[PDB]
Nucleic acid binder design. Sequence first.
DNA 1: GCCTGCACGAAGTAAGCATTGCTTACTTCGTGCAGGCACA
DNA 2: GCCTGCACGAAGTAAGCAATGCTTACTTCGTGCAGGCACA
Lengths: 850, 850
Amino acid sequence: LVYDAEFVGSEREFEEERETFLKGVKAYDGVLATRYLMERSSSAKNDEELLELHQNFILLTGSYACSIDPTEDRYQNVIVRGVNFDERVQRLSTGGSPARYAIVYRRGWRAIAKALDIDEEDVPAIEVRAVKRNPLQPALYRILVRYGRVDLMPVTVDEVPPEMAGEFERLIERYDVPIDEKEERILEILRENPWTPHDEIARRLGLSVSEVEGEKDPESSGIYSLWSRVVVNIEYDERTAKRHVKRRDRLLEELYEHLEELSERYLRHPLTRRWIVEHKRDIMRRYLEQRIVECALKLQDRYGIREDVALCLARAFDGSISMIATTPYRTLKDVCPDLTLEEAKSVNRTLATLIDEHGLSPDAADELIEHFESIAGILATDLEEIERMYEEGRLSEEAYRAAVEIQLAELTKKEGVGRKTAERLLRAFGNPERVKQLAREFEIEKLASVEGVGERVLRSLVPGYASLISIRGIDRERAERLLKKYGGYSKVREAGVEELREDGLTDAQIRELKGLKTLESIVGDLEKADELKRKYGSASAVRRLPVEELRELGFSDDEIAEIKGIPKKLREAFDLETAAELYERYGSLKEIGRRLSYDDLLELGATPKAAAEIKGPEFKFLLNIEGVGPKLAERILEAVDYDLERLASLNPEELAEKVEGLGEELAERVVYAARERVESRRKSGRQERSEEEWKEWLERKVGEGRARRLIEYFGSAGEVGKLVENAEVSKLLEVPGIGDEAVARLVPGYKTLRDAGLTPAEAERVLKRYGSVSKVQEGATPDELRELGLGDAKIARILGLRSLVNARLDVDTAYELARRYGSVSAVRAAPVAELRELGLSDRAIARIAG
Amino acid sequence: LVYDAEFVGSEREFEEERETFLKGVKAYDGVLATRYLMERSSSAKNDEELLELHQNFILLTGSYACSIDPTEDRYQNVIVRGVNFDERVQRLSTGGSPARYAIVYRRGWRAIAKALDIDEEDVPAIEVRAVKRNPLQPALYRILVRYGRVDLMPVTVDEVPPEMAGEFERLIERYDVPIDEKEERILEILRENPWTPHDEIARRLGLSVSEVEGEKDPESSGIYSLWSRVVVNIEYDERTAKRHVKRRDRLLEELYEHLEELSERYLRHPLTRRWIVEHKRDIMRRYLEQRIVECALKLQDRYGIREDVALCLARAFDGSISMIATTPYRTLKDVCPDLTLEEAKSVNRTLATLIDEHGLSPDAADELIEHFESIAGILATDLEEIERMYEEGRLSEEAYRAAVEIQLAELTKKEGVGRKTAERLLRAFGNPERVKQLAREFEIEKLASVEGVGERVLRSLVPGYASLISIRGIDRERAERLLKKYGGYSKVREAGVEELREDGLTDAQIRELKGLKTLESIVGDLEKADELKRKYGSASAVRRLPVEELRELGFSDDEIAEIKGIPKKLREAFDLETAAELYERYGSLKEIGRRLSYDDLLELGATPKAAAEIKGPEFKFLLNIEGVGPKLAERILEAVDYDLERLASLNPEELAEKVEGLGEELAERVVYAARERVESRRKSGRQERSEEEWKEWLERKVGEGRARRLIEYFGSAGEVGKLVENAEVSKLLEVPGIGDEAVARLVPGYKTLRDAGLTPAEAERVLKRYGSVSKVQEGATPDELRELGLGDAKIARILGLRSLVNARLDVDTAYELARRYGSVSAVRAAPVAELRELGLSDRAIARIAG
DNA sequence: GCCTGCACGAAGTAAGCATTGCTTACTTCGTGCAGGCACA
DNA sequence: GCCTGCACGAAGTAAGCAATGCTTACTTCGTGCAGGCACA
Ligand SMILES: [K+]
Ligand SMILES: [K+]
Ligand SMILES: [K+]
Ligand SMILES: [K+]
């Protein structure tokens, strides 16, 4: 039953006892490991050195057991299986230590281990009840242990006196002591074999085992009493005690080396301390007591129960956590009076839910627990059953109301399900779990038969019904049929086009269902689109495929140029390989004709006309007057960095200053033509919205009502437009009726900044500082945004550095890896050594790779 | 604005108009595809045959447009951009058809397409406003279209009379008709180029475009009026009309072939009708009006709104569904007076939530929508803001109550969060979304600072806090530190052992966290266990590894035998390869010595003694009496199928009948020894629990209280035990205070059958029919369970056929694939041809592989 | 709305990661019988 | 509780799939201007 012991001593004595007990545990672990070696290999069983090691481990276990509680006061209230060993020792003539008198019994260590707070996970087992294969006399061994005779306990099999083993009688006659008839009858049987089991001595005599053994005290009758009378009359040798205490530690650490030697000899692998601990756990977890300890540990760790209360609960409920969690509070108090209400709430989650989340008294919670066991039990019980139990007076008012509210809460948490509809569903189908199961079974018509179960209720209840009913032409019964046939929306989406056509679905319905509109725009065949979705997934992944892989899949060159979005002037000037490479390396044809040289364009296979077309439209315009020459027009555009306004700006004399090989006669004509062009250009886009145009634009953006509300609030549409152009988010929001889904509709980029976690004021500051979200992404530095009051998390989120910061990198280093490289994928596949060059640890680079 | 038209005709006329409009749509699709070919490749643009094909498509589009509304009565109330074209045609002298007079305008088809219910998804575009590259005279073309002159509209570019194109004046002078001064001023410009744009004619004359065009009626001034006066004075040729009607269909289906030919010539790929529709959509979805149609279609399909109401909503709110979902009901009623309240609830999910789930009037719901836009908007707003708005009278009582209840419900749905604690959290942190964000940020101390936020609340709120706090020795602050450092419980679990040790975690804590207890039992090193978890995953996968792979990883042979659980009698008799193969092929040494022959065991390298030990314990007993011979003992055991009771049962004379080579003298001794052994066996296990033993067993299983409760409900603990042995689940459950988590504790196998979806009565029947769940799995057939009243779904669940039925296979075929094979993995990797042998489709086999 | 392609900006949309919920042997846990590792 | 290894049964536990929720450019959507497809 109860194993308990309380340590009442100083910190010094506490450390002494902990060290002694841990060393004894190591000794008994050596015992068990030697037994495992004996049984694991018959070749090891043949070895006599292994038997000597086993006996030496037994001797050291006994020696360490003798050193426990030397002052006879470190332990009190020692209990072993309900038996109070304190009063049992007090009733003995020679008194002694209750701790040592407890360890000599089976599993007595469980008491002492609780007094010293030794981690019960590693099974701190110490047993000194060896009979067969014991180097000493068993009863003498146990008596020496219980009397704490560290001087008489040998520390080596070679130092074992024959008067303590085979010739034990020589030690008895040396100290006289009276011997009664029962003890002589036991001794005349032990003379045949001193290691005879006490069961055999009791059977070959007609006595009980308790009669043969007797109390471990001189004033008794039995072999224990005889050895007690013999040992009491022996003086305490201080010299041998000190020398054994000094020797035994090195002796144990040497026996472990011998054990590892024998394990290497017979198993070719060692026996780790961790392995020995795990083996002890796995060989002793079979019996309850170990399951009780494991359950009490689980309670202490997960629910924070005190040690003694958790142990008592585990004893009372066979170490079953679920059993304790389905037990009412009054029963838990009956079995454990020291249990607190908070502890019971922590263990019984149903009790805590009722009491705290529903304001029930512990007695009403006990009512609900006794009648329905758990919250899931309540959710399983029909509503009519609870109503009947309430109307018959078998269920209190508060308990009934709380149970009904729990059942209703399980259904009202779905969108569209009110309380009247939840009650109707509970009346029609009994319990919320039955409703959930009917929803899983796609019983759409059965649920729709209930009053108030509309489209919203079905879409919130039946998984995937929304996705199918929203398709044009798919009826409710058709959606139910599809869901029941294929088994969920996922399996209907994974169905092939042929079997979907056999069911009567339109090709448009199948396209909408499988999401193939983009691949239908790419390839005019539905089956090939579905097969591409199967093989690669998204249409973007097909667009990212190399040219060679696309050619093999059955694509023409024009189809590849259309898929990758290659411009006409770029797809006609070069072949697919070079055009696609230039496009996926520079992005825009403008960048192609601005970063590459005219000679470079020609060398790649471009017609001079095509190469001029690839060059900017100003390049085609420079050569359209007096033939300034491509070699010279390219340098002219490289000066102003491809800008007609920069060309029309400066004085002609500055041209020959910047561009070499340019005469000043052509410079004036260049500037004149550039000014003419910039005057002809700024005459088309010279537009500022009028009043009516601003009014119509507002009505289009935020709708009629909010538009006229804003117009009245700020005066005219012009003021609203001025606020929009200046990104006056705060001024727009103060109007009642204008929210984020309207400001973001008016101010481009507001929604993205809001989804990044920025407050409207912060987003307003950012928009005023940088102009738009794009300019923020390709321009803002973390310190810059830190000056605007943004936290590092918001900065990382808005700059696109989420993946890099997820690798446990700060925002500054992530922005540097984005600056000195390219995108995130550019750092994902990066020179592993160059990252170490930048001062990143190997662990940081490994996390970058992950 | 509004595009609308109502069809007022017979079913025959309806089909006629649908066919005519679809043919015109195909013609205009050909027009657009020819333009795409002209623009896509300059080589195709150089081709004159492609230009002739384009002009032929234009002519056929015009011819089909002339055939719309022939009886002049099929359409009424034709509206194009708010302009009612019915009254506009009625005010003209020559009257005519409103449909044709609408089609000649930009996007006029949108009206007629709504009258004929043509699928607007495919963009039924019909335009006859071609100027450049028009084979006829543009104004003459449009007038012929508006007057429905199918006879005068040519069907081939070669059939174009010069008096209708370049020499158009010849057709004018042929019919006299007065010409005013403005029309002569337009004609003297058209004599230069008949295809001059009307914008150019208005600019090079000083008039407006409407002044140059004029009304399409004789009583007007303009080129339209001139051509109207010319065309009205021409008789309708019935012969040419009939002949064009007969030709145009074949002509169009031939022009499509010419288009495919040119596309193969210039693109090496064809133009599918689906591709053409998708390209038309992608080039016309850019303009607003098409977005309006797409939004109205989305409304009709997803929310079941009537066509006209959805169209009006899409027009009024720029085709944005989100704007409509954030628009109050009164505004929607203002823009659409015909809108019903149910439609508004279906489109605005927040409105529906408020009205139905909270019983608010439409005005209170509109209040909440205006102030917070959405339910998520309410969840984002601080509670103090709503309190201020209510106390200032700017928020009605009902709206404030509903908002507070929404905010509170967002937190009470988490276990451990009551209402007082939810209110305290909302006061401390403003809004529930802020609380969720603080929980994601692992701000555990900040949340714990609020009164009533205990361990359960934190575990329900902070993701992964439960997994870390439940570990022995990990404090709350330590768990917060780990979660903030690595970023979630997953990243703490993915952390290496080295960095976890650097953080101060015990090796036991790291083992508990990373789940390496089994791999710690296998390998006594934590780092190697972690590396094995990284490489292979689960310890069972390492156990399943072949012997050679285990040897290379650094395992000894004894370590491998321990990993795979090889018995001693099996690991010592053979080598590692053969022993491991026999164990992974037969599972138990009993099955080894039962399925294999004694000679087969000897041939594999087993000692006769070891081979007898591998044989069943009865094999060692038959040879222990009179030396019956292994060759004969094997047949004796093969007769009774390895059963001592079957041997002791029958008469000795039946032995020589079954086993050949057996004398009748040995048969009597065999039966005698078998009866002696079976009598000596049933004398040790002959145990049936007494009353006190049943009481103690009940107290152990279901606890003291429920045990005495059951004892009081029935006669004695013996009756409870009798009910348990017979699996009387129903009679045990009827006891008040006994639930599923106690019956399942009493009746082994009940929990598994319940988790399979079986009712207590069904689980009771199954347990009574088969004895235990194991016997059900390895013995019950689907038809048998169907006889017991179980549905096929429950049968699939209980028999382990979930994976096979998920492949859209019925329970019978899945059970057959489990019978005629092995496990589910045996069907996963199966002969693909042998599955076709059993009558499975290729799709079924493909799903089996997946 | 001339007619769209090239091009850019960015959230509208929806791919993709993460979390959460359900199912089941996927793995761990509890029990019993022989006979050795060895008795209250 | 002799002692534990072999072995089976099964839910206790927790791997593994499924659905749901969050974040963000991941993929589409909306807009503008150039110059041709080519004009109220
Ligand atoms: K803890
Ligand atoms: K529908
Ligand atoms: K506001
Ligand atoms: K009950």
